Amino acid sequence: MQIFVKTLTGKTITLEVEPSDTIENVKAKIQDKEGIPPDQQRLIFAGKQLEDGRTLSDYNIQKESTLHLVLR
Amino acid sequence: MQIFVKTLTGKTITLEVEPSDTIENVKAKIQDKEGIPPDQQRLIFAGKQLEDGRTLSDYNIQKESTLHLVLR
What's B64's domain CATH number?
3.10.20.90
Chain B partners within 8 Å of A47 (Cβ) = 7-9, 36, 71
* Residue B27: count of CB within 10 angstroms of its CB: 21
* Overall domain count for chain B: 1
Whole-angstrom distance, CA of residue B10 vs CA of residue B6: 6
Whole-angstrom distance, CA of residue A19 vs CA of residue A1: 8
Total number of residues shown for chain B: 72
Q: Which helix (H) or strand (E) holds B30?
A: helix B23-34
Q: A38: which DSSP letter?
A: G
Instruction: Determine, for residues B47 and A72 on separate chains, whether the beta-carbon distance falls below 8 Å.
Output: yes
Are A54 and A23 in contact by the 8 Å Cβ rule? The answer is yes
Are B52 and B22 in contact by the 8 Å Cβ rule? The answer is yes
Closest partner residue to A46 among B9, B36, B70, by Cβ? B9
| Structural domain for A34, as ranges | 1-72
